[PDB]
């Protein structure tokens, strides 16, 4: 066929050529040696990869059977002893501190937003990489953070009343963040630098900063600067001065904009936010990841670092780019980009580590300017969907082997651990320990975690509704426990403690109001879906001193094993019939809305309107939750298969309507069983209870491959 033979492997030609012609040159790795390494690593580690997956299934079968033989509110003591007997719940290791070294300041020290985007989308990826600095005025004027009340609405052209509120909001932020010795930024008439100090002119007098150490730099003439640079909680704030701009001309000090350092780090995602089901899809992804690391990805282009004058008069530079992670896929899936002699597909996680690692070498050297990514010499890989410490140890050993193939020093490849599976949650300390010399973050992937919570306890009884899950005891303990485990392993000053994604892309007023809870909880980072959201979330890190919060949480134990293990079962007679229908409609709409873009267009993340037409930006995990929740309700007789059918039928034309204005869209209604997308949605629900750990990829990949093959002829 069209495959290349390397030992026991048969590699898709498009992948082979991409790696030879694009990825390898410039790395000084012998191509022959790389490919022999691919074959050897695959041969050596494939058996334990499979053994790990079989172990998952064996644990789940035992738990399924534990619930099925029980009639009695759970006896927690018994349930725990049981989880311990079967090896689900492992002993907690002794106290230790992580030793991870060679890590950039953005990760060890800086608290701020972390932006996650689909690596298949070059535009979004480039915009994300450039999102290290963002316009606060654009983010305020462009969103509902400033209410679109009467008089202040957005029109075809600039609205002065709204622009003045934007200005006012920012002046208030400045007062909160970098206070003057007296007076307010609201009344400033000019900025100058005198004797290395910022001098702010007010109408009656002049003043300096209450804390002059927050003055970081400036641009232009000291006596008439074009910008002033400030710093607060490790994050930079830049005031752009330009009275001959449309906004500056209206401004009392001629201020044009306030630029915030926003997306400090970015995760280029090969997993839940993309649809990649074969060699062609992987290659598009890998090529974008290459372009980012070489610095030559073009839609526009990547930003250079930013030049400043130091307060005393010297020159310095700040990074213009978000420091990049890459999120590889997890342990489950195989991909036909490589098959062995028997025709069996190779594990995709093993592939990603080899290829994303190889590609990452370019980000460690000069872009044909300075090197794009890690100055300290690390490669930052996020590893999702791991269950427990043996799976973390496997990932570390995988990275160890790749480092040898690639000629990198041991521990170059760092690991961002997603805590998004129950067996990792209740063994978190051991998971950190297994990666104690590689770990650069832990992060509560709460959506996947919810899916796994449902599947794990599928046989226990009917679960609460989807929108109820976020406030359940188990998840709130899970969030606290994650922070506690990180801090106790010495993450403060060493590694990020991260929390999850804000998915409501149009609800920015709400994000600003509520997401402050995450750095208040000691999270040094949290996820956002867009550069705009990164800029707004940045506000929270100026309001909250994360380093102090973490110092104050030290030694505390806020969650017990019992709370972590509290299954979210619905109480007796929880729902009226209309509330049941509403939940069914909600979940069917969520599934259909997501799956139609996934199967038909190969889109894994996008702005999808929900049932109430709220715009959501979720990844594949939302599908895992909804499919598992409906499977769980069907399993326990809350709804019937005809209820499911009827809701899918009702929701499909609505999804069809919601996708008007999509050039390539093809309706699901009314020819339902003509639509592969529709059949996928149905299959995800009806086979949901039988998917390993509730995972949606096996069905989703098959259906997308089916769609591609039909579209070919
Ligand atoms: O937050 C998550 C969690 N993943 O484990 N992923 C994500 C990535 C891009 C847009 C929306 C989402 Br939710
Ligand atoms: Mg996830
Ligand atoms: Mg409920
Ligand atoms: Mg402070």
UniProtKB/Swiss-Prot annotation:
It is found in: Cytoplasm. Its main location: cytoplasm. Disulfide bonds: none annotated. The modification Cysteine sulfenic acid (-SOH) is found at residue 605. Coiled coil: none annotated. GO terms for biological process: adhesion of symbiont to host; coenzyme A metabolic process; glyoxylate catabolic process; glyoxylate cycle; tricarboxylic acid cycle. It catalyses: glyoxylate + acetyl-CoA + H2O = (S)-malate + CoA + H(+). Keywords: Cytoplasm, Glyoxylate bypass, Magnesium, Metal-binding, Oxidation, Transferase, Tricarboxylic acid cycle. GO terms for molecular function: coenzyme A binding; fibronectin binding; host cell extracellular matrix binding; laminin binding; magnesium ion binding; malate synthase activity; protein homodimerization activity. Glyoxylate binds at residues 327, 420, 445-448. Acetyl-CoA binds at residues 116, 123-127, 273, 300, 529, 604-607, 619. Pathway: Carbohydrate metabolism; glyoxylate cycle; (S)-malate from isocitrate: step 2/2. Mg(2+). Mn(2+) is able to replace Mg(2+). Its cofactor is Mg(2+); Mn(2+). The keyword Cytoplasm applies. The active site is at residues 327, 619. The keyword Plastid does not apply. GO terms for cellular component: capsule; cell surface; cytoplasm; cytosol; extracellular region; peptidoglycan-based cell wall; plasma membrane. Involved in the glycolate utilization. Catalyzes the condensation and subsequent hydrolysis of acetyl-coenzyme A (acetyl-CoA) and glyoxylate to form malate and CoA. Belongs to the malate synthase family. GlcB subfamily. Homodimer. NCBIfam families: malate_syn_G, PRK02999.1. This is Malate synthase G. It comes from Mycobacterium tuberculosis (strain ATCC 25618 / H37Rv). The gene is glcB.
